[PDB]
């Protein structure tokens, strides 16, 4: 696949393409060297570095604003920033008492805001101009991952905590869910129904397993399930990321096995499994129309510090894999 020119210097945690509101395609990557980097992508597959910004700590999540003018950055330095791309100046918009692991834009009919989720077991909501969070919600444990598609948010915590929120008028807890997964939670991603309404989510575990959860299906015991993935004595690797093709509703997973795989949760099939890379695949995402699949190959720490080679190269790869994720 296609390599991004001028990759980050340490391991990449997060990737986020630009919204449909911008012409073309711009990719954002966060890294363990504390940087957020923005590459323009062109139909040729060539990529152009456009701008960068740095935290005083590793960058754990990133996301855009729906109009495309801002990039949001959440970092181990216990803050998050709003980066205005035009002026190329960034300011702090959020403060936490611990690293900020997740960050998301909420475009609702009555309010817009940034949602940050932190290892300080809090969930904060920000208007981007006030130093005061407009809302603070308490988590049972430390935030490990989340995803947002109005009017729904999902948040997984440590101790297999798993919560769903409603976002109409103002955010508020909707229901706590007994986790379907037996092991540590790492990734999550919301999927939608035929009517384009958020309807459930897929949940990745460290135990080579993904759970599909519908919020309100007719027969939960049949309609909800878990499948095995990212295993090669069978070896079991962690699942580091998950994303739904924005058009087909199929999905991709990437795991510490250094592979990626495509899936159809309605047919319950594996559509594709790539070959093994040198390193674990630590993140991934789709462009706004699903014509581009982007994944990052970096050490994820899934075997401790001893196996960390800081002189090994960190790669972001691009794949035009729209057809490979169509179902039959």
């Amino acid at each position: 696949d296609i390599e991004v020119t001028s990759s980050p210097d340490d391991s990449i945690g997060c990737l986020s393409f630009s919204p449909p509101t911008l012409p073309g395609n711009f990719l954002i990557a966060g890294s363990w060297a504390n940087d957020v980097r923005c590459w323009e992508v062109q139909d040729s597959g060539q990529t152009i570095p456009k701008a960068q910004q740095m935290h005083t700590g590793p960058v754990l999540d990133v996301c855009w604003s729906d109009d495309g003018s801002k990039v949001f950055t959440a970092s181990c330095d216990k803050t998050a920033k709003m980066w205005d791309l035009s002026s190329n100046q960034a300011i702090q918009i959020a403060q936490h008492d611990a690293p900020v692991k997740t960050i998301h834009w909420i475009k609702a009919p009555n309010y817009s805001c940034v949602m940050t989720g932190s290892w300080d077991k809090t969930l904060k909501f920000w208007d981007t101009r006030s130093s005061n969070p407009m809302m603070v919600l308490q988590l049972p444990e430390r935030c490990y991952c989340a995803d947002v598609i109005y009017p729904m948010a999902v948040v997984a915590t440590a101790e297999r905590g798993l919560i769903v929120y409603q976002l109409e008028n103002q955010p508020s807890e909707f229901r706590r869910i007994e986790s379907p997964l037996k092991h540590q939670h790492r990734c999550v991603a919301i999927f939608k129904d035929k009517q384009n309404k958020p309807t459930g989510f897929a949940l990745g575990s460290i135990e080579g397993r993904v759970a599909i959860h519908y919020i309100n299906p007719p027969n939960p015991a049949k309609d909800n399930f878990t499948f095995k993935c990212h295993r090669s004595p069978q070896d079991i690797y962690a699942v580091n990321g998950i994303a739904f093709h924005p058009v087909h509703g199929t999905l991709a997973t990437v795991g510490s096995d250094g592979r990626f795989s495509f899936w159809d949760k309605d047919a319950r099939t594996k559509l594709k499994t790539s070959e093994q890379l040198d390193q674990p695949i630590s993140a991934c995402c789709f462009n706004h129309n699903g014509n581009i699949f982007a994944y990052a190959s970096s050490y994820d720490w899934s075997k401790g510090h001893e196996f960390y080679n800081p002189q090994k190269k960190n790669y972001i790869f691009l794949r035009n894999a729209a057809e490979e994720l169509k179902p039959r």
Binding site: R209, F225, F227, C229, W263, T269, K270, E324
Partner: peptide
């Protein structure tokens, strides 16, 4: 890249 059925947990 052949399409197989998922290894589901039973």
């Amino acid at each position: 890249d052949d399409e197989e059925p998922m290894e589901l947990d039973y």
